[PDB]
Amino acid sequence: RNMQEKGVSEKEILEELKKYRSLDLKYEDGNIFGSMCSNVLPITRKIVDIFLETNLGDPGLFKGTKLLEEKAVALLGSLLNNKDAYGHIVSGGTEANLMALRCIKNIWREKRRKGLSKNEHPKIIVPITAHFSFEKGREMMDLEYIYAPIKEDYTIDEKFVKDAVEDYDVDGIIGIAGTTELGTIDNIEELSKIAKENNIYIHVDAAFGGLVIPFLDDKYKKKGVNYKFDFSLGVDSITIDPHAMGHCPIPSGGILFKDIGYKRYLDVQATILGTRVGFGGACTYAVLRYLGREGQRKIVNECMENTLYLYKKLKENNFKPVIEPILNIVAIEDEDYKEVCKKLRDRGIYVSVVKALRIVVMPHIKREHIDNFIEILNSIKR
Amino acid sequence: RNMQEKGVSEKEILEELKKYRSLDLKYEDGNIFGSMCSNVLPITRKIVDIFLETNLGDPGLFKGTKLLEEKAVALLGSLLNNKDAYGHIVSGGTEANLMALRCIKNIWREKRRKGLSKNEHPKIIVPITAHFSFEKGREMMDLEYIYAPIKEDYTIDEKFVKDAVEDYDVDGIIGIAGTTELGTIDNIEELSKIAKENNIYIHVDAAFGGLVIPFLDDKYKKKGVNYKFDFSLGVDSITIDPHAMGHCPIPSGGILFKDIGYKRYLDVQATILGTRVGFGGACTYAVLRYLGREGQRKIVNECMENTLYLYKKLKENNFKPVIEPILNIVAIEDEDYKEVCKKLRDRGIYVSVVKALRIVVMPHIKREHIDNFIEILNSIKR
Numbered sequence: 048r049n050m051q052e053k054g055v056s057e058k059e060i061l062e063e064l065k066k067y068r069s070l071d072l073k074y075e076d077g078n079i080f081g082s083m084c085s086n087v088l089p090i091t092r093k094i095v096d097i098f099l100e101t102n103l104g105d106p107g108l109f110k111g112t113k114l115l116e117e118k119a120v121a122l123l124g125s126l127l128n129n130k131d132a133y134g135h136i137v138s139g140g141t142e143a144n145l146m147a148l149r150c151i152k153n154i155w156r157e158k159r160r161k162g163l164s165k166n167e168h169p170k171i172i173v174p175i176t177a178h179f180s181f182e183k184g185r186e187m188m189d190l191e192y193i194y195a196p197i198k199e200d201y202t203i204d205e206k207f208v209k210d211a212v213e214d215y216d217v218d219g220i221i222g223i224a225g226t227t228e229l230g231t232i233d234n235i236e237e238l239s240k241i242a243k244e245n246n247i248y249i250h251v252d253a254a255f256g257g258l259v260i261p262f263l264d265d266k267y268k269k270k271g272v273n274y275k276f277d278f279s280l281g282v283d284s285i286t287i288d289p290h291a292m293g294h295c296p297i298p299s300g301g302i303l304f305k306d307i308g309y310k311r312y313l314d315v316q317a318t319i320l321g322t323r324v325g326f327g328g329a330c331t332y333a334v335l336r337y338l339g340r341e342g343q344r345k346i347v348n349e350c351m352e353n354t355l356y357l358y359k360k361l362k363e364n365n366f367k368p369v370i371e372p373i374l375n376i377v378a379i380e381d382e383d384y385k386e387v388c389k390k391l392r393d394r395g396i397y398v399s400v401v402k403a404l405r406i407v408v409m410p411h412i413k414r415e416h417i418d419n420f421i422e423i424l425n426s427i428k429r
Numbered sequence: 430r431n432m433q434e435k436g437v438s439e440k441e442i443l444e445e446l447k448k449y450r451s452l453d454l455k456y457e458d459g460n461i462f463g464s465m466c467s468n469v470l471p472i473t474r475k476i477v478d479i480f481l482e483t484n485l486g487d488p489g490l491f492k493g494t495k496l497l498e499e500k501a502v503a504l505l506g507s508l509l510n511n512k513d514a515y516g517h518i519v520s521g522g523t524e525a526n527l528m529a530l531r532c533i534k535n536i537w538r539e540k541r542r543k544g545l546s547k548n549e550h551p552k553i554i555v556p557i558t559a560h561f562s563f564e565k566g567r568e569m570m571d572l573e574y575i576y577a578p579i580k581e582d583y584t585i586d587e588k589f590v591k592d593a594v595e596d597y598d599v600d601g602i603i604g605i606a607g608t609t610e611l612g613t614i615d616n617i618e619e620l621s622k623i624a625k626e627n628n629i630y631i632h633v634d635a636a637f638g639g640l641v642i643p644f645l646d647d648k649y650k651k652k653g654v655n656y657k658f659d660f661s662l663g664v665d666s667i668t669i670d671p672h673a674m675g676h677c678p679i680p681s682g683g684i685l686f687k688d689i690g691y692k693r694y695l696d697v698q699a700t701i702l703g704t705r706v707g708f709g710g711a712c713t714y715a716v717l718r719y720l721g722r723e724g725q726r727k728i729v730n731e732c733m734e735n736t737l738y739l740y741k742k743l744k745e746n747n748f749k750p751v752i753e754p755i756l757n758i759v760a761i762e763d764e765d766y767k768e769v770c771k772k773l774r775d776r777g778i779y780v781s782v783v784k785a786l787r788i789v790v791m792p793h794i795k796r797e798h799i800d801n802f803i804e805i806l807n808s809i810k811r
């Protein structure tokens with residue numbers, strides 16, 4: 048508990064907080080196997096402190112922090128082969144996807160006002176592998192989704208999309224570059240061709256994959272898998288999150304549009320949030336500058352090294368991975384996955400739960416953690 | 430800016446960032462007069478550091494940080510006279526208002542599914558003084574707003590609301606406890622009576638006022654103004670933001686519902702955001718514990734002292750305040766307000782822009798800043 052009249056000392060409240068923090072898991076401890084967040088680059092702690100008292104909801108008061116957001120967006124745009132990208136460092140991939148959906152809906156609204164659409168709601172083709180943020184957008188914005196099926200490799204069925212675009216009036220297409228559950232990559236090149244030929248907005252959700260795919264060594268690329276996903280394909284927008292594989296503190300999400308022409312369709316401030324952090328843009332810019340491509344490549348392929356190590360140890364121990372990994376994500380088929388996940392928790396191993404256990408090999412997962420995991424899983428299986 | 434192959438040193442990137450930060454204004458410098466954010470309580474810098482690598486989007490991994498969010502919500506609920514409040518420490522007042530609107534809409538949706546509503550969209554009574562986040566919600570969620578007029582004192586016209594509820598089928602009422610432009614307080618007691626008698630959900634936007642009104646000394650209360658706004662009136666939800674007058678770092682917004690029965694109407698995670706900070710809840714709990722009611726009362730009435738000082742100096746210098754201040758907000762009538770605001774900027778004074786200059790007397794505004802402001806404004810007026 049209740050609000051009290053008298054205050055307490057700093058030592059008292061800090062000691063209480065540290066007691067609660069001790070109940071948390073920590074990324075570096077070998078417990079967390081199912082998270083797409085990880086330890087932040089240590090330099091970001093100083094940056095957060097420097098920029099803590101900024102607010103990109105009032106950029107007129109923080110001109111330098113606003114310039115750093117623009118520079119962060121420019122570095123992401125350059126990474127994605129688009130020097131003219133218009134975008135924002137937002138709160139996460141959810142706000143980024145919601146902003147893309149707002150844009151899609153407002154393009155549709157303009158058509159409706161001219162009589163150029165028989166759809167009473169925007170009609171959007173969305174693969175069934177789409178992240179839950181897309182359901183939040185549908186539920187809030189009254190969108191109609193045409194759920195696209197996936198093929199045997201768990202990527203979107205491009206022929207279905209092409210057929211649906213022929214039959215139906217379609218207002219948007221979603222493709223995923225690094226799905227949440229398995230890390231697979233939709234055929235963005237074909238989707239973008241369908242979209243361009245039919246004048247349909249295409250959004251690429253690269254929340255996770257956007258900071259992984261551009262850095263993959265050829266050893267980890269698979270024949271037949273297409274890795275192109277960015278603005279070189281002419282897509283309309285891309286979600287890409289520094290607080291996932293960019294080692295930046297939450298909140299650091301990213302939404303990039305092809306050019307500034309898209310800004311007018313975000314009119315109602317283009318972000319959903321009002322008051323909002325300035326340190327996300329500063330950290331995004333600084334981490335990408337500090338690492339350069341070489342530093343991020345090292346981290347990404349270190350994760351891929353450990354991902355393929357985990358995949359190999361799984362098969363050696365007669366476990367069945369859902370797929371050979373595409374990104375730093377592996378899933379283990381298990382009919383008793385719910386109970387096995389709970390047994391793993393009791394032994395200090397936290398995976399996520401497709402009837403499978405899901406492991407995200409973030410930079411905090413080392414070979415010793417994978418060895419420990421296999422030992423505990425073997426033991427659980429009798 | 431362009432992405433580079435080679436990284437740069439920490440000294441290089443920190444020096445670049447500090448150069449951009451030097452272009453920002455800082456709260457403590459006597460420049461910022463129109464912001465509802467201010468300096469954070471210094472202890473929160475340590476808390477941010479401790480909880481930087483947490484994520485309340487995956488609370489199963491951070492049980493202690495999640496408990497601290499629940500305790501933060503409980504302290505706010507206790508402040509608002511509701512020990513059973515269900516709520517979240519979200520990204521800000523915008524997400525908080527959007528979540529209340531989602532709840533209103535889902536209550537309406539349940540009625541529509543039963544044939545209990547002739548409204549094709551939720552119909553919500555909203556005063557014309559409402560914050561822009563309400564327009565974001567209307568635009569995203571396809572809500573129908575009945576804009577309520579305001580009286581001569583700039584508070585919502587309760588008779589209009591009562592008449593509209595008699596004539597129309599209404600799905601929600603919004604009342605504001607501390608408006609953005611003038612800091613006035615709607616007659617929540619009467620609105621809540623109308624709402625309860627007609628079975629209408631009522632949301633109170635106390636984003637700013639929620640951490641001011643409960644701490645006002647009687648000297649600053651005005652005869653005829655009602656200051657009751659919280660769950661003692663039986664309202665359904667209240668937005669209240671620690672990163673406004675709670676001295677907590679962004680992002681620290683708050684949304685409290687009357688009880689846990691409201692959670693089911695937030696189903697599609699109840700927050701809009703997915704991955705999200707854990708330090709907002711930790712800071713909210715710790716700042717309120719560290720200060721206690723006595724510490725927040727001191728700060729609030731210090732701001733009110735300087736607010737009434739500013740109001741007195743304005744009248745002494747023949748300026749016309751829009752209203753005698755209710756909260757720590759004063760607005761100066763000026764036909765040339767746009768040009769005067771620009772002239773003030775050129776002289777280092779940043780107000781916001783009702784045909785008036787708006788000053789928010791946050792804790793960083795001291796008597797010397799108000800004296801400086803009057804001198805510059807006098808000088809500008811020839």
Ligand SMILES: CC1=C(O)/C(=C\N=C/Cc2ccc(O)cc2)C(COP(=O)(O)O)=CN1
Nearest residue numbers: 082083084139140141178227254487703704
């Ligand atoms: C493809 C895609 C995603 O996998 C995704 C998040 N995914 C996973 C978010 C997560 C992170 C850590 C953790 O412990 C649990 C979950 C989002 C939303 O991104 P967010 O708002 O930053 O969470 C969009 N697209």
Ligand SMILES: CC1=C(O)/C(=C\N=C/Cc2ccc(O)cc2)C(COP(=O)(O)O)=CN1
Nearest residue numbers: 105321322464465466521522523560609636
């Ligand atoms: C009554 C009400 C508000 O005045 C409000 C914000 N108000 C002002 C936000 C602001 C803060 C600092 C600044 O420099 C400029 C603007 C919000 C939204 O709160 P937010 O998402 O935390 O910005 C809701 N209701």
